[PDB]
Design a protein around this ligand. Structure first.
Ligand code: T9Q
Ligand code: T9Q
Ligand code: T9Q
Ligand code: T9Q
Lengths: 268, 269
């Protein structure tokens, strides 16, 4: 991978692996999400950001400050097949005191056609108290030199799917998958559950009939609270309609919300 | 990746990804196992083997015959770090009517030093009845032309760890992790649980204290029965031992039907 000519974005190509594909012999949405994460990490490394905590600086490490994902939104037009090469371009942009936005464009390496796009919102917080904090000018100036100054949006539409408010699913859920627990392969280098595992858990409550007759087109996911490595999760889904679903991930005991989201599926 | 000059082995390089590493910032044993699987699949594809079923031919597909892993044995000297490049060489050799053996050598791309090795045993089975059956000369001849004829062993030693018999763990287990279920990311393109998920499930019952103070050196795993996508598994571990050794058992949560057994050897960091 490499930073582009103007140094304001980063590109990387990936060959889709045999264990990365589903029943259709095309990459899963979790494989796609892992690749967005990988290119995001390579972009931060390329410009000197910390190898201990994603997108942190010496200034943030002293203050025990981290960046956390608030929302992830992915739209796929064509899933690459096993053996195919996908090229991914990513860039970051400031969003004031609220936080930051990282966007991605996925392309077919051979044709050059856009096969997907993603956008994510990040907020700053103290890693110990878990309290959200406003980004100071000192922290802001550090990353602004690596962002384009004119708005570059993967989802430019005024009032598009990526910015829609997500409601809370009401009991009883139409479908559910309970007792979901993370194993060591679900944890990152800091022993935290990987953001991609939550996408998998959300999709666990979609009936196999939907998965067999449809392809996932859009997924929007809010990250409200972290699942600890010894927590147990219940994944809940209700049809709201193409097929549309409302999703809720909550702790198996007290029902504390960890994530909420929506999915849109297209008939094969 | 590519077949080597003589066409009797295959090499591929991989850059270790950020999500592929553990707390030590080095690749997990499941990341290593996924890469051995990937290079194994690329080698079969490079010489015309089926894209629907691993290492099958038109002859095998007609008879509903598949190859299944009976045993996997991995030894790691150094786990590659995030950003490092690992080069893997793999080859296959016939083992008579019993089945085949696929071996691997892992190397550091920069230094050229061997950082690991693996060996696996495969048996042929009817995919519908799940009945094992000896390999016929017709099936044998099809793959022999892609194998070296002189013995090429990743574990050459006459009485070595890769061929040791594994005993059945007796209750009560010293440690356990109960209620393990596969999710969709654990399934392959044919809806079967990925062979690597079983390695993860085995390791789920190792205490976190061992994982924090030791590094995994050797893992040997027998595959006895397949876990269906709606089965629930219990992972059991007992210490059998400077170095730490463990005996492992994976069985169905209800009736206790054995799916896997194995051993692990850990070295103090
Ligand atoms: C360390 O992560 C870097 C990154 O860019 N992450 C993207 C992502 C966010 C949420 C879900 C899936 C993927
Ligand atoms: C937390 O904000 C998202 C993010 O990726 N920030 C670091 C970064 C910004 C600009 C270029 C490269 C890396
Ligand atoms: C389709 O698999 C091709 C292959 O060579 N797999 C090796 C393997 C066997 C068991 C556990 C992990 C890896
Ligand atoms: C089932 O045995 C393991 C295996 O990988 N067989 C296929 C093969 C043999 C020789 C070269 C390349 C591919």
């Amino acid at each position: 991978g490499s930073l582009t000519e103007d140094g304001l974005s980063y590109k990387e190509k990936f060959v889709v692996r045999s264990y990365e594909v589903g029943s259709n012999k095309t990459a899963t949405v979790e494989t796609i999400a892992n690749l967005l994460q990988e290119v995001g990490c390579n972009h931060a490394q390329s410009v000197g950001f910390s190898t201990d905590g994603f997108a942190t600086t010496t200034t943030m490490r002293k203050l025990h400050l981290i960046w956390v994902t608030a929302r992830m939104h992915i739209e796929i037009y064509k899933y690459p097949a096993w053996g195919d090469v996908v090229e991914i371009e990513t860039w970051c942009q400031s969003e004031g005191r609220i936080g930051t936005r990282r966007d991605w464009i996925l392309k077919d390496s051979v044709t050059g056609e856009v096969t997907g796009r993603a956008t994510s919102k990040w907020v700053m917080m103290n890693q110990d108290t878990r309290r959200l904090q406003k980004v100071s000018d000192d922290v802001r100036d550090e990353y602004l030199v690596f962002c384009p100054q004119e708005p570059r949006l993967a989802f430019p539409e005024e009032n598009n799917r990526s910015l829609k408010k997500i409601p809370k699913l009401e009991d009883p859920a139409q479908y559910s998958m309970i007792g979901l627990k993370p194993r060591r392969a679900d944890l990152d280098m800091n022993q935290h559950v990987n953001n991609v595992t939550y996408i998998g858990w959300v999709l666990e409550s979609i009936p196999q009939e939907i998965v067999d007759t449809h392809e996932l087109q859009v997924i929007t996911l809010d990250y409200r609270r972290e699942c600890q490595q010894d927590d147990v999760v219940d994944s809940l889904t209700t049809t709201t309609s193409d097929s549309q679903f409302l999703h809720l991930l909550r702790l198996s005991g007290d029902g504390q919300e960890i994530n909420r989201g929506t999915t849109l599926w297209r008939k094969k």
